[PDB]
A and B are shown apart, each in its own frame.
Chain A
């Protein structure tokens, strides 16, 4: 639903195996209360899962085990944007990619363990 901080993905599309792709997420609203952001993927029939995360003021990053050094997450806390540089994409990476902000320790699911969510952008990898 609506929220204090609004998130907005873009940059998804159709590519083939080995190609690169760069997602971005525009944060708006009470952007000063943002302490961390992350990229998640919702694979077909599957619950969304963590891909990459970044701390807002430290800029420190962390990646899921299937990233294998292929992806790079970065943020611009002045422009209020977070980016995911996806290199060497594989057919297994095909999923809806969601932008999220502010992890929450309490919550029964990944969705409820983050305060703010975007609306998702489709990433499709063929070949």
Chain B
């Protein structure tokens, strides 16, 4: 099966910072690349940040320099450090990986940026 449990998020003032967490279970976490996705209003769900099992990271253009993805293999969790938040970033954020043939998604944590 496998389960991704996201935590953190919520309402935050623009210019402030949040930190999301995603605890994994039922999967071999060390061998998998983990991704953060988000679905903004009116837009298709898009990739936000990726971290490979070897540690390399990729970021969408609109979050470069503001977000940081990192993993703790001992805790089987991945973090998304969001700095300098903007209403651009208001979306439902999803933790993701692909253990076998079916996509494994977290429940979806909402991030709402106010002014």
Residues of A within 8 A of B (CB): 32-33, 56-61, 72, 74, 76-79
Number of interface residues of B (CB under 8 A): 21
Given A74-B58, A78-B35, A78-B96, verify A58-B52 contact (CB < 8 Å). yes
B80 to chain A, nearest CB (A): 16
Residue B11 is within 8 A (CB to CB) of chain A in the complex: no
Residues of B within 8 A of A (CB): 31-33, 35, 37, 45, 47, 50-54, 56, 58, 96-99, 101-103
14 intermolecular pairs with C-beta atoms under 8 Å apart: A32-B102, A57-B33, A57-B99, A58-B33, A58-B53, A59-B52, A60-B52, A60-B53, A60-B54, A60-B56, A76-B47, A77-B35, A77-B98, A78-B47
A76 vs B47: C-alpha distance in the bound complex, in angstroms? 7
Counting residue pairs across A and B whose Cβ atoms lie within 8 Å, the total is: 47
Please determine whether A59 and B50 come into contact, CB atoms closer than 8 angstroms.
yes
Looking at B31, B47, B99, the one whose CB has the most chain A CB atoms below 10 A away is B47
Please determine whether B47 and A59 come into contact, CB atoms closer than 8 angstroms.
no
Closest to A81 in B: B47
**B37 surroundings in chain A (CB, below 8 A):** 78
B26 to chain A, nearest CB (A): 15
Please determine whether A57 and B98 come into contact, CB atoms closer than 8 angstroms.
yes
Looking at A32, A61, A78, the one whose CB has the most chain B CB atoms below 10 A away is A78
Given A57-B33, A58-B31, verify A74-B101 contact (CB < 8 Å). no
A32 vs B98: C-alpha distance in the bound complex, in angstroms? 10
A45 vs B32: C-alpha distance in the bound complex, in angstroms? 39
